[PDB]
């Protein structure tokens, strides 16, 4: 019964393994034949293995006391020169922006011959589910939010006359029909329509484009394939006949003030451009109108420990000349990505140290302490793993965010410590995101080993 079937399966498997072993044996037999042929292709210089000399330099000689009955052999110890060692470290992943480490199925594609019509949750389901308006990325790793979406789920003039070819509105008695149909969604089209086959892909594309464009017909005909505008009106008629500082989390609620009922208010944070609330929202941060350099406590962004959003602060300089060096506003250099070059050398205190090649003045950006975002609990586990070998790189960014740059960081992770540091750390919220910026405490001259007070961080 079952035992017999198991025995038969075992016999078949044994035959299979024997057969594969034999076949690989034949292949490896040919390969080892050519290998031994290559081995016998060329000889080698006769290694006499002469017993060196008899104390050529008059140094210590070897004592090879053979355990078996043989005389002890003596050979001078030919000492070899030594080489400079190197402090220990592990491999690391280069990086320049933060990385949040994680802690009937669908419709067919219009591409290809196989296409149809499907508008259950409209025809736009794949490109609307995975999205991130902040970084413009599909299923991004920077903003690993809840992502409630899952499983890939206006006035204009009338186009009178037949624009190019025959237009829909130029047809005798159809514009008023379109107007009446639009009004009801809260002479006229009496002529019989044409009969042209419409494919599923064309139907879906026309439906989506009309839903997003509405009354316009010449343009939709231009962007569609064939699709005579009169036929467009015909389908339009027929379809109706058929039927403690946190990052700025955006809020979407049109015609709704943000006051005691908004997550931005609950977090004591201003609504940013990504927020979809009313343009006259109470919590909206007014763009500071600095003349330049945004480095005085005068600017509300500077006074409240914040950077400058290019959408709000226009004349401050945080938006103009995006593709350039650090902007005039000195409160937006973290977002721009411009920093100072750091070098690596054996530290004069212990281990390795980051040695800046250029001098940095008082309160100046040096580099961003990037890494991988992990929650406080994941920060605890990662820090324990790193401290297993007694070298931690954990740093605090926000209340519930911690940057750890052991497995993935930059050259700024090799920061030494003293009671009198030459540098200090200050976190600034850039474009609704928190990014640590390293600042020099005093006028640092060229090429010295840097410092940073560990007492500021969680790991002191």
């Amino acid at each position: 019964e079952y035992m017999r079937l198991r025995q038969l399966k075992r016999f078949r498997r044994a035959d299979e393994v024997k057969s594969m072993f034999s076949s690989n044996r034949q292949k490896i037999l040919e390969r080892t034949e050519i290998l031994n042929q290559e081995w016998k292709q060329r000889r080698i210089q006769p290694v006499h293995i002469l017993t060196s000399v008899s104390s050529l330099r008059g140094t210590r000689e070897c004592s090879v006391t053979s355990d078996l009955d043989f005389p002890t052999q003596v050979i001078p110890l030919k000492t070899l020169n030594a080489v400079a060692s190197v402090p220990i470290m592990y491999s690391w992943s280069p990086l320049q922006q933060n990385f949040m480490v994680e802690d009937p199925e669908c419709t067919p594609n219009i591409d290809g011959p196989n296409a149809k019509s499907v508008q259950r949750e409209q025809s736009l389901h794949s490109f609307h589910t995975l999205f991130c308006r902040r970084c413009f990325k599909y299923d991004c790793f920077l903003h690993r939010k809840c992502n409630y979406s899952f499983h890939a789920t206006t006035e204009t003039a009338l186009d009178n006359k037949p624009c190019g070819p025959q237009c829909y509105q130029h047809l005798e008695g159809a514009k008023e029909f379109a107007a009446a149909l639009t009004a009801e969604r809260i002479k006229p089209n009496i002529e019989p329509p044409e009969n042209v086959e419409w494919s599923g892909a064309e139907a879906s594309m026309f439906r989506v484009l009309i839903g997003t464009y509405y009354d316009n017909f010449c343009a939709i005909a231009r962007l569609i394939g064939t699709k005579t505008c009169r036929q467009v009106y015909e389908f339009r008629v027929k379809e109706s006949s058929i039927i403690h500082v946190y990052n700025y989390q955006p809020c979407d609620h049109p015609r709704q003030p943000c006051d005691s009922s908004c997550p931005c208010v609950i977090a004591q944070n201003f609504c940013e451009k990504f927020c979809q609330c009313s343009s006259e929202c109470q919590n909206r941060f007014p763009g500071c109108r600095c003349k330049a350099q945004c480095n005085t406590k005068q600017c509300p962004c500077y006074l409240a420990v914040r950077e400058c959003d290019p959408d709000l602060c226009l004349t401050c300089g945080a938006a103009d000349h995006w593709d350039s060096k650090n902007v005039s506003c000195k409160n937006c250099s973290i977002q721009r990505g411009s920093k100072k070059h750091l070098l690596l050398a054996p530290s004069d205190v212990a281990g390795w140290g980051i040695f800046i090649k250029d001098p940095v003045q008082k309160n100046e950006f040096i580099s961003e302490y990037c890494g991988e975002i992990i929650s406080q609990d994941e920060a605890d586990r990662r820090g324990k793993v790193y401290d297993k070998y007694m070298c931690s790189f954990l740093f605090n960014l926000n209340n519930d965010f911690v940057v750890d740059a052991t497995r993935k960081g930059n050259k700024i992770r090799f920061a030494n410590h003293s009671v009198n540091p030459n540098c200090y750390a200050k976190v600034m919220m850039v474009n609704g995101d928190h990014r640590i910026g390293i600042f020099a405490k005093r006028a640092i001259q060229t090429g010295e080993e840097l410092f940073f007070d560990y007492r500021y961080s969680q790991a002191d």
Binding site: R57, T59, T79, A82, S347
Partner: peptide, 16 residues
């Protein structure tokens, strides 16, 4: 503290 970097002398010439 950082130990002595390396004894450049006497690495090999001590016996000589």
């Amino acid at each position: 503290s950082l130990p002595r970097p390396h004894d450049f002398f006497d690495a090999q010439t001590l016996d000589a």
